[PDB]
Design an enzyme around this catalytic site. Structure first.
Site, PDB file in Angstrom:
ATOM      1  N   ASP A  83       0.847  -1.190   0.000  1.00  0.00           N
ATOM      2  CA  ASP A  83       0.000   0.000   0.000  1.00  0.00           C
ATOM      3  C   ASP A  83       0.891   1.251   0.000  1.00  0.00           C
ATOM      4  OD1 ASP A  83      -2.108   1.960   1.083  1.00  0.00           O
ATOM      5  OD2 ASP A  83      -3.140   0.008   1.121  1.00  0.00           O
ATOM      6  N   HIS A  91      -3.302   6.192   3.826  1.00  0.00           N
ATOM      7  CA  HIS A  91      -4.036   4.948   3.568  1.00  0.00           C
ATOM      8  C   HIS A  91      -3.297   3.738   4.129  1.00  0.00           C
ATOM      9  CE1 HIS A  91      -5.856   1.717   0.928  1.00  0.00           C
ATOM     10  NE2 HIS A  91      -6.942   2.439   1.129  1.00  0.00           N
ATOM     11  N   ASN A 101     -14.826  -1.102  -4.434  1.00  0.00           N
ATOM     12  CA  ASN A 101     -15.874  -0.221  -3.919  1.00  0.00           C
ATOM     13  C   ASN A 101     -16.878   0.274  -4.954  1.00  0.00           C
ATOM     14  OD1 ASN A 101     -14.377  -0.287  -1.348  1.00  0.00           O
ATOM     15  ND2 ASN A 101     -12.931   1.026  -2.476  1.00  0.00           N
ATOM     16  N   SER A 108     -11.175  -1.483   1.476  1.00  0.00           N
ATOM     17  CA  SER A 108      -9.797  -1.345   1.948  1.00  0.00           C
ATOM     18  C   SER A 108      -9.699  -1.430   3.467  1.00  0.00           C
ATOM     19  CB  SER A 108      -9.207  -0.001   1.485  1.00  0.00           C
ATOM     20  OG  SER A 108      -8.864  -0.015   0.104  1.00  0.00           O
ATOM     21  N   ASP A 124     -26.240 -13.518   8.668  1.00  0.00           N
ATOM     22  CA  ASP A 124     -26.583 -12.348   9.478  1.00  0.00           C
ATOM     23  C   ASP A 124     -26.700 -11.073   8.661  1.00  0.00           C
ATOM     24  OD1 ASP A 124     -26.490 -13.957  11.740  1.00  0.00           O
ATOM     25  OD2 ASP A 124     -24.632 -13.082  12.551  1.00  0.00           O
TER      26      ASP A 124
END
Ligand SMILES: [Ca+2]
Length: 279
Positions: free
Chosen positions: A39, A69, A161, A224, A260
């Protein structure tokens, strides 16, 4: 061990119910295992890492995390206050620049580097690689991720995402690695999280407080953030001897909270990462 007033994400990982506020975990806390965070880098000097974090590799002019990040993700793997496995060893590989991007060529290089570098480190309880990144489909990138996994590293990757099928993203689409979706504090699928048959597991991903640069903290969202929950959990369970690098993803799916989650499309696992701790 119990951490009171823990971030919601850590409390969820060790509870069969949403809404609790304590993180129950085994005091071994990942000691003896190592996690490569691939990263933007890690602020290794942040007090919350207690000296357990180290920059080992950069592909730019410096090894510093100028984005935040990588520091936030590493904090979820392994920080004292915000981390899954509070005693694990953290190694930073900076394949992303301080704006958050980097070419597939560099990401593949970073993955191949971890596969060989791990033979120079003392990691008796095993090795984990956390990849909270990705982009459009690439089989060269998939194949690097599969090589990393096949060399004996537990590879956990963000599903992405885009609220789409992660089949069109990499390394998220590689079947041999562990692809992680995101959930929120009410056990709903996070509204941004990719889904699909390639997903293996869900972890907490909305409003995750963790470490940040300048020795600060902040709360952000993304798959992430869910990925280091699962990478930390694997190092936690490898330290306990519950599973190996080759099998850890499948063990975590076997022992997950089932059914769930809300807002899960037909064909996608309803499995939420869970540590099964019993005092
Ligand atoms: Ca998989």
């Amino acid at each position: 061990a119990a951490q009171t007033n823990a971030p919601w994400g850590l409390a969820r990982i060790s509870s069969t119910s949403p809404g609790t506020s304590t993180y129950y975990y085994d005091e071994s806390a990942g000691q003896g295992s190592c996690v490569y965070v691939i990263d933007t880098g890690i602020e290794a000097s942040h007090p919350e890492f207690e000296g357990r974090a180290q920059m080992v590799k950069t592909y730019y002019y410096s090894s510093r995390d100028g984005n935040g990040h990588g520091t936030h993700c590493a904090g979820t793997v392994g920080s004292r206050t915000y981390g899954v496995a509070k005693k694990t060893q953290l190694f930073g590989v900076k394949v992303l620049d301080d704006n958050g991007s980097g070419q597939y060529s560099t990401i593949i290089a970073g993955m191949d580097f971890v596969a060989s570098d791990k033979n120079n480190r003392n990691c008796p309880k095993g090795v984990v690689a956390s990849l909270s990144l990705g982009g459009g489909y690439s089989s060269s990138v998939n194949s690097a991720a599969a090589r990393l996994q096949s060399s004996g590293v537990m590879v956990a990757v963000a599903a992405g995402n885009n609220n789409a099928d992660a089949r069109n993203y990499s390394p998220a689409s590689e079947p041999s690695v562990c692809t992680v979706g995101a959930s929120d504090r009410y056990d709903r699928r996070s509204s941004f999280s990719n889904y699909g048959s390639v997903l293996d597991i869900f972890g907490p991903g909305t409003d995750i407080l963790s470490t940040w640069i300048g020795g600060s903290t902040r709360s952000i969202s993304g798959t992430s953030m869910a990925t280091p929950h699962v990478a930390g959990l694997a190092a936690y369970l490898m330290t306990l001897g519950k599973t190996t690098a080759a099998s850890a993803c499948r063990y975590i799916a076997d022992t997950a909270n089932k059914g769930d989650l809300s807002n899960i499309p037909f064909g996608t696992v309803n499995l939420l990462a869970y540590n099964n701790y019993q005092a």
